[PDB]
Ligand binder design. Sequence first.
Ligand SMILES: Cc1cc(=O)[nH]c(SCC(=O)c2ccc(S(N)(=O)=O)cc2)n1
Ligand SMILES: [Zn+2]
Length: 257
Amino acid sequence: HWGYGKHNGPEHWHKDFPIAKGERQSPVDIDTHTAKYDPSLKPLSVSYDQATSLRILNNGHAFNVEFDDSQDKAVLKGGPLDGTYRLIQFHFHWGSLDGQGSEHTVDKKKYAAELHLVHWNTKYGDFGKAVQQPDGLAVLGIFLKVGSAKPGLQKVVDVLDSIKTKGKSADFTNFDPRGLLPESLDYWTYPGSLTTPPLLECVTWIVLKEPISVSSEQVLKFRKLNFNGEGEPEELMVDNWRPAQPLKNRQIKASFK
Ligand SMILES: Cc1cc(=O)[nH]c(SCC(=O)c2ccc(S(N)(=O)=O)cc2)n1
Ligand SMILES: [Zn+2]
């Protein structure tokens, strides 16, 4: 039922998922002047050398590039995290226009898109158990602006016409997510939630300050995907982002300055 239209978009989700109005919802606006530099925060450790991508899936909301997370191969640690979080998938949220699409904002600035690399805390054994814990997930968020192409994104873009509609998947092996990272790992972090239903409050968010640049042609191909299934009226997959939610009783911390 839920999605991103007038009839079933973010402003409706609370009726099936009442935590939509909870105390630690995501995304948020990152007010860079009031984020506190925390000299106790560690460099993030992103260890993606042995990542094993398997498949890419249009799930009707976004596309997910999925990884084999049955061993400790692509892991996030350090930063604000205790313990070791394993990469399970990444996906993006993007707009119908270059001036919107990100979920997080920075001093109210929206970016053209935002990439989420989703990781789960290995102390909980698997992703389905982790989402039921307040420290179950760590999502690394990276902003996309439109400018020069991102060469490490092109393999993803070029497979999208094979997964145009909801429910389609394609083999997607040997994809290296290190090609999607900016140069700096400086970040903001705060406790929050999944940004789509079920909206569970299980995520430590780590949002990088440096955006990556993608070309206008790369994001135009994201906007050619469809939310609908094959044989249904075409609804372009655009504007699949949740707007910023109330910060409430939270403190965003900065790893830098
Ligand atoms: C309990 C449960 C199980 C599941 O398979 N998916 C979900 S929601 C989908 C999901 O895995 C997910 C959703 C949103 C985000 S986000 N947009 O916060 O990074 C990350 C992962 N919830
Ligand atoms: Zn997301």
